[PDB]
Amino acid sequence: DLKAFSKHIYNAYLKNFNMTKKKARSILTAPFVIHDIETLWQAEKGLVWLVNGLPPYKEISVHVFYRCQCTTVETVRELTEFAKSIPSFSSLFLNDQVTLLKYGVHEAIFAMLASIVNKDGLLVANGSGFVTREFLRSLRKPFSDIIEPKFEFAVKFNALELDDSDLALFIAAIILCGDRPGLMNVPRVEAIQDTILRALEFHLQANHPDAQYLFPKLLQKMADLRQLVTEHAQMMQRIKKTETETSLHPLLQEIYK
Ligand SMILES: O=C(O)CCCCCOc1ccccc1CN(Cc1ccccc1)C(=O)c1ccc(-c2ccoc2)cc1
Numbered sequence: 618d619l620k621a622f623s624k625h626i627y628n629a630y631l632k633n634f635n636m637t638k639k640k641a642r643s644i645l646t647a648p649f650v651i652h653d654i655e656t657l658w659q660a661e662k663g664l665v666w667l668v669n670g671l672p673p674y675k676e677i678s679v680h681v682f683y684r685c686q687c688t689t690v691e692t693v694r695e696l697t698e699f700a701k702s703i704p705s706f707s708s709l710f711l712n713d714q715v716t717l718l719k720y721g722v723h724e725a726i727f728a729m730l731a732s733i734v735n736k737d738g739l740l741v742a743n744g745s746g747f748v749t750r751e752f753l754r755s756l757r758k759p760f761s762d763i764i765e766p767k768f769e770f771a772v773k774f775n776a777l778e779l780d781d782s783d784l785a786l787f788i789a790a791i792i793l794c795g796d797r798p799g800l801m802n803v804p805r806v807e808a809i810q811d812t813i814l815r816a817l818e819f820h821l822q823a824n825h826p827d828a829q830y831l832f833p834k835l836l837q838k839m840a841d842l843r844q845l846v847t848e849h850a851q852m853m854q855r856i857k858k859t860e861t862e863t864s865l866h867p868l869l870q871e872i873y874k
């Protein structure tokens with residue numbers, strides 16, 4: 618029954634997300650490279666890319682920041698459907714579901730989208746483009762500061778060489794976390810989390826027989842993710858207060874409220 622539990626989560630993962638890690642890493646090993654202002658313009662013109670649907674133009678750094686919001690908001694949508702495809706998550710009261718998503722999605726995003734990252738940059742536009750790390754570093758503060766930490770985490774995370782089956786359970790564990798503030802039914806969520814963590818350890822034993830310390834290594838990554846997101850939240854607060862011309866998607870406003 619724990620097998621059926623784990624297999625259901627994996628199916629939900631495949632159904633609700635666009636690109637698997639399998640696809641992502643095969644591409645990275647060709648997409649149009651965005652490495653400067655000109656190539657960014659060319660990408661927006663047709664070689665890669667809802668530019669007309671974005672907020673009014675302000676500047677290059679802010680424009681990229683808007684493209685960042687596009688992807689995260691899209692990933693939150695997918696994560697929500699993925700979570701809702703899990704029976705134990707859907708059996709929670711709706712307000713608890715929102716609490717878990719609110720405090721869980723960014724942890725899940727940074728872990729899950731590590732797949733589309735290497736040391737040189739990351740995939741964009743469903744894998745049609747590749748934006749260099751150097752270009753993102755070249756953006757002005759605070760936009761370059763909010764980006765770089767994710768690369769450091771991603772490359773270290775990708776070194777564990779998880780596959781999509783591992784990630785499905787790992788992301789589920791992140792969302793179903795009993796530590797989120799304001800949770801109504803903590804014991805129920807804690808119990809679900811424990812079950813997923815048990816399923817994960819069991820899965821890792823079979824899928825990575827030679828991989829020692831892999832499960833405790835992943836528990837440490839969950840701790841790292843909490844720190845990453847906390848720092849990220851702090852930087853988003855700085856942008857909210859100091860970048861008046863920079864708008865924020867309403868959904869993200871609610872998350873950082
Ligand atoms: O708080 C929020 O949700 C919105 C505020 C996010 C601000 C920080 O966003 C990023 C920071 C570091 C890396 C990547 C991203 C954004 N992401 C998600 C991500 C996150 C972590 C790992 C991997 C992918 C992107 O996928 C991405 C999309 C488009 C571009 C782009 C377009 C044209 O030029 C550049 C660049 C990146």
Ligand SMILES: CCCCCCCO[C@@H]1O[C@H](CO)[C@@H](O)[C@H](O)[C@H]1O
Nearest residue numbers: 693697715718719868871872873874
């Ligand atoms: C779509 C799933 C992800 C949604 C994440 C956004 C959650 O925002 C929160 O929504 C609650 C209303 O339900 C409010 O009470 C909180 O003040 C607000 O912060």
